[PDB]
Write an enzyme that holds these catalytic residues in place. Structure first.
Site, PDB file in Angstrom:
ATOM      1  N   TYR A  70       0.819  -1.196   0.000  1.00 16.79           N
ATOM      2  CA  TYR A  70       0.000   0.000   0.000  1.00 16.79           C
ATOM      3  C   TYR A  70       0.845   1.233   0.000  1.00 16.79           C
ATOM      4  CZ  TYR A  70       1.155   0.057   4.981  1.00 16.79           C
ATOM      5  OH  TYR A  70       1.827   0.059   6.180  1.00 16.79           O
ATOM      6  N   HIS A 130       1.463   5.696  13.919  1.00 18.94           N
ATOM      7  CA  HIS A 130       0.399   5.340  12.993  1.00 18.94           C
ATOM      8  C   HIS A 130      -0.486   4.251  13.572  1.00 18.94           C
ATOM      9  CE1 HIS A 130       3.309   2.142  12.307  1.00 18.94           C
ATOM     10  NE2 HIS A 130       2.332   1.442  11.751  1.00 18.94           N
ATOM     11  N   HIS A 192       1.083   3.083  17.102  1.00 19.31           N
ATOM     12  CA  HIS A 192       2.380   2.517  17.449  1.00 19.31           C
ATOM     13  C   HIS A 192       3.472   3.068  16.556  1.00 19.31           C
ATOM     14  CE1 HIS A 192       0.556  -0.488  14.650  1.00 19.31           C
ATOM     15  NE2 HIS A 192       1.775  -0.602  14.153  1.00 19.31           N
ATOM     16  N   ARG A 203      17.590  -5.135  12.913  1.00 18.59           N
ATOM     17  CA  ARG A 203      16.361  -5.761  13.351  1.00 18.59           C
ATOM     18  C   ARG A 203      15.489  -5.957  12.133  1.00 18.59           C
ATOM     19  NH1 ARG A 203      10.644  -3.814  15.354  1.00 18.59           N
ATOM     20  NH2 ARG A 203       9.969  -5.907  16.034  1.00 18.59           N
TER      21      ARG A 203
HETATM   22 MN   LIG Z   1       2.177  -0.840  11.867  1.00 17.43          MN
END
Ligand SMILES: [Mn+2]
Length: 218
Positions: A70, A130, A192, A203
């Protein structure tokens, strides 16, 4: 006032926790085998073997979109799926090594996941506050972490305030090999994000989601 603010933060943190489930499902060996395939994906991307919209590059982070991806479209909310066939298919190893294991341990139903995004972070990487777009993705939101232990932050208003004024409502530890499942309040009613200082070594996270049948496309 600050005492009140503090009690309020505690109360919100309780609510966030109510919508979080975590478990350690991948051993060190399983993690290593998956990590090698993530490195394969990065290698193939660097060789230019994926479609353009599959790979999104930024200074300290790369995103690899599979199955569905997206972006912000011209303007529900503004996010839109790419046209059918624009992003590359979910690799078999994501199905066999990651999803099938999640299904076996009853984290998600069979046939739920049709989107797999690999986020690859270097130390100092950052993601903006977001909510995963609710007009694109059904809940729950699943994420699987690799390469190193880190933290996922909830309640990310601190991102827009001076240093020393605010902090995350909740910092959730996300260890290598852990599966994180977001629903309810945690997925729908709070933001978050990721803080640079929480990424101390490379990571990577595999985010596994279901797109809505009616999700709008560009
Ligand atoms: Mn997310």
């Amino acid at each position: 006032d600050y005492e009140e603010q503090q009690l309020q933060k505690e109360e919100e943190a309780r609510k966030v926790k109510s919508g979080i489930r975590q478990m350690r499902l991948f051993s060190q060996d399983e993690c290593a085998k998956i990590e090698a395939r993530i490195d394969e994906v990065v290698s193939r991307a660097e060789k230019g073997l994926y479609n353009e919209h599959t790979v999104d590059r930024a200074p300290l982070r790369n995103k690899y979109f599979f199955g569905e991806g997206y972006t912000y479209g011209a303007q529900p909310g503004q996010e839109r799926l790419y046209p059918p066939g624009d992003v590359d298919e979910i690799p078999e190893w994501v199905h066999q090594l990651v999803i099938q294991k999640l299904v076996e341990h009853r984290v998600i139903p069979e046939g739920f996941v049709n989107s797999a995004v690999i986020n690859d972070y270097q130390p100092g990487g950052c993601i903006v506050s977001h909510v995963d777009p609710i007009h694109i993705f059904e809940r729950p939101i699943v994420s699987v972490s690799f390469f190193s232990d880190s933290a996922l932050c909830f309640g990310c208003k601190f991102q827009f305030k001076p240093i020393r004024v605010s902090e995350p409502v909740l910092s959730l530890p996300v260890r290598r090999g852990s599966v994180t499942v977001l629903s309810g309040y945690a997925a729908d009613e709070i933001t978050h994000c990721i803080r640079p200082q929480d990424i101390k070594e490379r990571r990577a996270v595999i985010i596994l989601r279901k797109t809505r049948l009616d999700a709008p496309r560009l």
